[model samples]
Target: MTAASIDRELVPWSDPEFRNNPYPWYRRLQQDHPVHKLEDGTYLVSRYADVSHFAKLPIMSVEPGWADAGPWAVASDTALGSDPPHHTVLRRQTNKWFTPKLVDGWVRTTRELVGDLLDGVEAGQVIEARRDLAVVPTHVTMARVLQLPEDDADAVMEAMFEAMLMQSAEPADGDVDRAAVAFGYLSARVAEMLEDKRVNPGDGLADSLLDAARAGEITESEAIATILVFYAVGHMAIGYLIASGIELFARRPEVFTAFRNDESARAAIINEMVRMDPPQLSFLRFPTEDVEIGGVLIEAGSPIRFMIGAANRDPEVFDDPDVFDHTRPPAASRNLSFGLGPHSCAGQIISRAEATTVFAVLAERYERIELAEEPTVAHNDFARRYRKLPIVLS
Candidate 1:
């Protein structure tokens, strides 16, 4: 382990300020001590290789309650807070829908939804870009994918999105309890869908999940968790990506034009945007046992945090990492923006497809679009979402 004194000022993963502009702190931390310890006694991986390597480590855990001292605290073991066999099983149940082939099949409907949402925007008027544009397609695509009732999909997703993104000056002491209550309500919703599928299995992914549950491959609780994972990942991540992508394109007219001209460029641009300002700054992992990463020794059961946002901006990994280059030759060592290893985002394929459909349609629809004012950026330990993105579109 590196004997260097832990950089005390190195931004804590949960610090709101770091969420706003974490790159500077990440750069400083990576430069001074690649493998740094936090005052809370967790180890952080900020460099590209270290972050990716640590993510792949089976011992590192990704469960909740890593840095909090609330009632949400477990003996430090929950499904999302556990390592291995359970994590693998939890991930498997959701991976099918996120697969590329299945996700690509839904593109036509996805593009249609984006078109309809954008059509509602009054031309030449400053629009609430996040609400009017970003929210709809994500909710719609997810509803269709999960066979959720069309009418209730938007409202439910908005609540879940709020739960994920809400950051109050007075943070809730019972945030986890509130989340559990929300999950219970949402789980009941899914259960209703599951019951309906039992009688008449729709040809969508929800029905497929119901089928799996019936086959005894997973328990009812596991099934519900799987469905909720879909709800959270589908809307929140895509919403942030759409809002952020539009803002990025607006700032660079030439990049917008390039995407408009080349459809294949969508994947590259989406990947690049993800690398530049990924929705999540850091993801939590726990050590299965004692392990050393980047020369920093982490105790067994210690919470491990990997900073994807920082790794994305690592100078060693990308040429001009800060520059939003849509045309960067596919860097073999791109940051673990989505994540790394087996538990890395299962929804990557779905995320890519949704982003491509949205970006392609938006680029073609608007000749120009720009921010009406400086957006009030939203930040959390995990997400850097937008609260307000006012866009004057032509």
Candidate 2:
């Protein structure tokens, strides 16, 4: 790796300044050290071009097998951690359910679900948008679409959170025990669902995955693990997307007005929001061999973070990178929010549909929106999640 002889700013994960607004720090990283080497010998790759090119490289592996032990070492059975052939077959089974054009049914369910959550709020009343609005509709819709038991929605969501333990890069104290228990519960729950699908299979993701298993395209264990991964993928990014979009609206009431009155404005707001603050800041990939990027050579087996947060705001790519401009060209489509290549997020279709619906429906019900107080956020290496978004819709 190249000698880093610049500002050695530690990634202040819990620092308030970074949590509240991380773009400034991201800008600095992109400019100062394109291939930033962390204290632990890990690397952070910024710059839109580098992140995009590296993402498409076949050698950048997502298999948790790169880890000896950790939260990531756990989910090896799912497509999330596998390479081609297996990944292709497993993902193909679920792609029909997530295809952008074909999943109008799921999108309709999301709109109806969020509309009810919005109607439940009283006039001029403040609510935690992170919970009632941003997080619920998507999670509930996934549960309904997967045909999960009606009463199991909350439990499933809770299990997913407790088990998250953040990405593999940073694990909290007692992470192993907590993650082990939560994933155990999730695995058992998925197994039960798959067994039920066997006797009385219906038209849902779980049933289709089971059919693939029976056909010998994938194993029984792979089918169970794939469903568990679905719950994780379906909820996390989609929740953050809605939460961040609402924060933007509360910060600028005029944006809300434009979104409310102009049907055409939704696309711009949605596009800009995704570009400005994506669901995740970065994701991990282990290089299979020594790779040179932008003149810096990172050794084999080095863990590198493809910084989506930085790539989305790369001034080289976007004019006035930090400013939020809805009129900006759609070139922001090049942003790595949904990632690129074979590992592109299968959840992008549903996530975009959910966030767009929430923004539209919220504007429909409220004449004005404002932040009640500073939001509650927790910054980690991979994401800046909205724990509480206090706001008034009047």
Candidate 3:
């Protein structure tokens, strides 16, 4: 199948219904036009091999300045937006705190937090899983790890949302002012934390960033930007994963039962959930020069969006790609949810730890979990997340 054979109007991005359930559209794209160009001229690469290959290309740049001006110019200053050797430098400076040992150490605390959150949920009463169950735990964990004041969770959550909105394919109305206000608050708070750490240092991720700045390893702005990015990615991504996993469990009881029976399968279960429906659906890259992908020549300076959700469901890679198979072996090799190449997620260890702890606690305490109604899916240019997952726990 070719792009010409497929109707251009059938593209998923142009359809509102596609947001509710995207897998069918993804399958269509994979079967017909694995590499498609959108109305805006940005290419969308849906197949697993194409996404993985494009993600790792040395010339594919993450710098937002390639497409936009003003605010986007500063976007590349952080770890997520910069390319090597600056990306390497930023990543190395912050790697120690996210190591396996450190993330494991937080598991006990995470489990306790999850238990407390679940305790607040009364049996037979409907609860919004994403808001009540998923958001707080992830926010609290991020706050605890960064040593941010507990009172700041609400503001932090707001700032993270604003950040995500600004990074989307199209910013919503009034998103610019809101993003400015939100980021300004966070930047000021981070500045205050930096000052406090200077006189009295503590052993936390924030202090590690401060120390790096003091040692001239990174500039002060980079340190603060890195922390903000960490908060945005850690809180939003992990929370979405937990909520989506719980929703999956509620929808597929057999999978949940398998997870309950075999505790060791928890990791694979979360990985599979992310593979099926990642929090961040796509990531943008700009080619420094013309490149050929799947036989098509993509010109330099054209933006390309690699659809992680589509790639994960590529029929060529996974059998029955839509099925939620708890028994599926760990396929990190085929998963691009955490991403691929040097810019892959830095806090995946922490993400996995939190998801495992949350689900473990849920499985142990709750006898059954079921949805009260059809869950509402949140629409974003670059992500697919649950806005509300009304569920009953008994």
How would you encode candidate 1's per-residue C-alpha lDDT over 252-304 as one tens digit per residue?
A: 87778878888777677777888888887777777768887877778887767
User: How good is model 2 by TM-score?
Assistant: 0.91
Every model's TM-score: 0.86, 0.91, 0.91
Task: Give the whole-model CA lDDT for all candidates, comma-separated.
Answer: 0.70, 0.76, 0.76
Error of 3 at 388 (Å): 2.4
Q: Write the per-residue lDDT of candidate 3 for residues 1-394, one digit (tens) a residue.
A: 5554354444545356776677777788778878777657788898898998777889988885422633444456677778888889899977777788888776676777777767776668888778667777777777678776545655676676765566666566777677677767777887787677678888778778877887998888788778766755556788888888888888888778888888877777877888887888888889999998877899998888898988998877788888877566545324889998988888788888888888888889776789999988766647766678999887
Worst 10 residues of 3 by lDDT: 65-74
**Could you give candidate 2's per-residue lDDT for residues 24-132 as a string of tens digits?**
8888888887887877777889999999988678888887442454554546767667778678987788787877776677878778877776777677778888877
| Candidate 2, residue 123: lDDT | 78
| Model 3 regions lying over 4 Å from their true place | 1-8, 12-14, 64-74, 329-333
* Residue-level error in angstroms, candidate 2, position 222: 1.7
For model 2, name the residue pairs that clash: none
**Best-first order by lDDT:** 3, 2, 1
Alpha carbon deviation, residue 337, candidate 3 (Å) = 0.8
Off by over 4 Å in 1: 1-8, 12-17, 63-92, 165-174
